[PDB]
Amino acid sequence: SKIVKIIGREIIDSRGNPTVEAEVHLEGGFVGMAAAPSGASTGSREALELRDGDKSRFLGKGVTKAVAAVNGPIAQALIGKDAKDQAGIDKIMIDLDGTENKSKFGANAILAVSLANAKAAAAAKGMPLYEHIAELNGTPGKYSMPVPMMNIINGGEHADNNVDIQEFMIQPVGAKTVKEAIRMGSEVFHHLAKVLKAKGMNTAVGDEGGYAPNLGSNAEALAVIAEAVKAAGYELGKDITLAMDCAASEFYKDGKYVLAGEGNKAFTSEEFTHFLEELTKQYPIVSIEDGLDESDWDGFAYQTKVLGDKIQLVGDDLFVTNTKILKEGIEKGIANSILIKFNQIGSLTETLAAIKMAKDAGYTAVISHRSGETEDATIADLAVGTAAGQIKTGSMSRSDRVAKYNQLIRIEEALGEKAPYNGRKEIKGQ
């Protein structure tokens, strides 16, 4: 219906840093509240989030400016508009901003309202968000419960150990329902902690709820995980598959990839692609995110030609949820998958556009969370509403992560067979 009021406030995320949370009100008492995850405040590739440089507030990470944009212009600009029309609401906001990277109001402001709007509209139509999204996509009944790749071991910049891979994940492909999948992840999660304690390592979770023990090498990280899956009564490859985020840009120096977890050995773009290939042979690894540097396109073309047929090559920093970039990659045969971060683009409309493009190209879409999350679980409704097939929302710890898993349980509970859990079949190259 019609928007009669838009409220914007400043709340705290899962890491203690401020963030925006819109609240679109429609005629009839209907309301839709949503928050925005942490994003990049700097850079010339992705939509930036506006934070106040005010160092006398949250060490300079406040978002009153962005919040002001919501209450100020954004509000008055959306008042009277038909929230039911998503593309339109996201259009009159991105244009008002004027800039391309949404620097004026900030992506953390446009997204907050963008989502809140969708939820508000979904309420007026007497239906869940995942149902409304499906309609906006033009695929109403087309649902599916996303196969989750759960963070379990952290390394690189997200840890202080001899592990290069930023994060190791597990995928309960053997499950028949997302509910069973979540349980499997929980059990392995707790069993890993047992293995880490026996090894005298720290079991204190991280930002994503996973463990960041001081492992002496990449192999050890893969070993502790393998031992966990077994102790949990599951078989590697059959019940659980392994996914990973290399974040290769982190260990890319002087045109080469230096892995400290490999004894500080150096690898050329081509050599690393073969190093990963060898890993996918000794381990059930079926998904590799950012296996190379975002600029190493020539290398990605090679990695895709060698792994793209059997292993899913997900681009995170490579595509930064951008249609232009992803479009070029598709034509140049770069990768075969993309990680979706709606806060990295700004709106739901654009996010949907990115998911559709990947689908049309044969690429897989992995709806992802962010390091700084909130109670919000929109990505859960987004994954199901667009039948993304896969989701990346953390480990089985910390509500900022588990909130998404609980939402998936609620959703699958109300959809049953209407939203099947395809497991492996969702993973490219499977």
Task: State yes or no: 13 annotated in a binding site.
Answer: no
Q: Which is catalytic among the residues 84, 341, 404, 428?
A: 341
Q: Which is nearer to a copy of itself, 303 or 407 (CB)?
A: 407
Per-residue x/- marks for a copy of itself, 3-42, CB under 8 A?
Answer: ------xxxxxxxxxx--x---------------------
Angle at 3 between CA 134 and CA 103, to 5 degrees: 80
Q: Which is nearer to Mg ion, 316 or 373 (CB)?
A: 316
289's tokens: 């995110």
Helix (H) or strand (E) holding 273: helix 269-282
Q: Which is nearer to Mg ion, 195 or 311 (CB)?
A: 311
Task: State yes or no: 392 annotated in a binding site.
Answer: yes
Task: State yes or no: 262 annotated in a binding site.
Answer: no
Query: Which of these, 44, 124, 135, lies nearest to 352 by C-alpha position?
Result: 135
Least Å from the CB of residue 327 to a copy of itself: 35
Pairing, β 9-12 against β 18-26: antiparallel
Q: What is the 3-state secondary structure (H, E, C) of 94-134?
A: HHHHCCCCCCCCCHHHHHHHHHHHHHHHHHHCCCCHHHHHH
**Phi, psi dihedral angles at 331 (to 5 degrees):** -65, -40
Angle at 65 between CA 344 and CA 325, to 5 degrees: 20
Is 199 among the catalytic positions? no
Least Å from the CB of residue 27 to Mg ion: 41
Number of residues that bind a copy of itself (CB under 8 A): 44
User: If you write DSSP's letter for every residue of 40-84 in order, what string do you get?
Assistant: -SS-SSSPPPP-B--TTSGGGTB-HHHHHHIIIIIHHHHTTSBTT
- Tell me the window of 167-175, 189-197, 268-276, 419-427 that interacts with a copy of itself (CB under 8 A): 189-197
Is 278 among the catalytic positions? no
* Cα–Cα distances in angstroms (integers) from residue 354 to residues 84, 121, 300, in the given order: 21, 22, 20
Residue 54 is a binding residue for a copy of itself (CB under 8 A): no
Query: Rule CB under 8 A: which of 399-418 touch a copy of itself?
Result: 399-400, 402-403, 405-406, 409-410, 413
Q: Which is catalytic among the residues 21, 131, 187, 208?
A: 208
Q: Which is nearer to Mg ion, 243 or 380 (CB)?
A: 243
**Could you say which of Mg ion, a copy of itself, none residue 368 binds, taking C-beta under 5 to 8 angstroms by partner kind?**
none
**Could you say which of a copy of itself, Mg ion, none residue 245 binds, taking C-beta under 5 to 8 angstroms by partner kind?**
Mg ion
Give the three-class secondary structure for 400: helix
Query: Rule CB under 8 A: which of 206-245 touch a copy of itself?
Result: 206, 209, 212
Feature table: binding site for Mg(2+) = 245, 289, 316
Active site residues: 208, 341
Name the site residues for Mg ion (rule: CB under 5 A).
245, 289, 316
